[PDB]
Write a protein that binds this ligand. Structure first.
Ligand code: CRS
Ligand code: CRS
Ligand code: CRS
Ligand code: CRS
Ligand code: CRS
Ligand code: CRS
Ligand code: CL
Ligand code: CL
Ligand code: ZN
Ligand code: ZN
Lengths: 30, 21, 29, 21, 29, 30, 21, 21, 29, 21, 30, 21
């Protein structure tokens, strides 16, 4: 897996693909 | 949160997986 | 499989934009 | 859900907002 | 609906690249 | 909707999704 | 233009909609 | 148009350039 | 054509993420 | 290949990694 | 074609679309 | 490599095509 800043939409896509069937929660900024 | 961990710093895959359900 | 998987990718990117700081849950099982 | 509503037909940004939060 | 909608998303991203500063119109109705 | 710099391809995608059936014009830099 | 308004500065949705046909 | 030409079959970058400007 | 072409776009973006610095070949003919 | 394996059914990140390098 | 930094996933997408049926090799950093 | 040529500097289309098979 990459060693990169995953930000904005890339962060969400990477989540999408990492989590597969589990799905995910995206809080954005905390 | 995920932004502060993986956007402002860099994340491992394992670190990214913390945000799966 | 793939077609709904490919759709899913676009939905999440759309959600990111529309929701902003609110964020969103993405799930259904 | 979102997939059955928004992968069969087009969901506008207004429709997608329903799924925020 | 969706399949041509999903295609559309990819067309516009392609257009952005190929067209550059020229830009482009995206429409058809 | 986000509070972010929408640049390059993200700007065009965001347009695409915001404008729906109307479509849009993308001038790029002016 | 849209780039100077929404890329170099940040745009509202309403501001983005100025660029629809 | 572009959708009927480029969503049925693959449009190369050369083909897509027709729609620039 | 397009459907496998649209899939291809998503595969390569996935590959970019999963492979990282390793990179990858994308081909098949 | 990847297209026939991963466009017919969903390839997870684990499956896609097979095609790295 | 654009005059831009193509980085990360944009670089790979741009490759994908530029190379068409030939395909490509993405070494990432060298 | 492609990153050093097209990401850290800007690339022409011709320069990008060096990375096709
Ligand atoms: C609709 C659906 C099913 C399974 C997993 C998901 O993330 C989404
Ligand atoms: C924005 C978007 C993506 C995918 C499907 C849709 O109906 C809408
Ligand atoms: C082809 C088409 C129809 C309607 C709206 C659009 O933006 C594009
Ligand atoms: C680049 C691209 C996107 C979508 C359809 C096409 O034929 C070509
Ligand atoms: C991540 C990804 C993209 C496209 C098809 C797949 O099966 C998986
Ligand atoms: C599967 C396939 C066929 C032809 C070209 C490609 O880049 C990939
Ligand atoms: Cl970016
Ligand atoms: Cl798609
Ligand atoms: Zn980006
Ligand atoms: Zn797609």
């Amino acid at each position: 897996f990459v060693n990169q800043h995953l930000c904005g939409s890339h962060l969400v896509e990477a989540l999408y693909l990492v989590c597969g069937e589990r799905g995910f929660f995206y809080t954005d900024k905390t | 949160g995920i932004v502060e961990q993986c956007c402002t710093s860099i994340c491992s895959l394992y670190q990214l997986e913390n945000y799966c359900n």
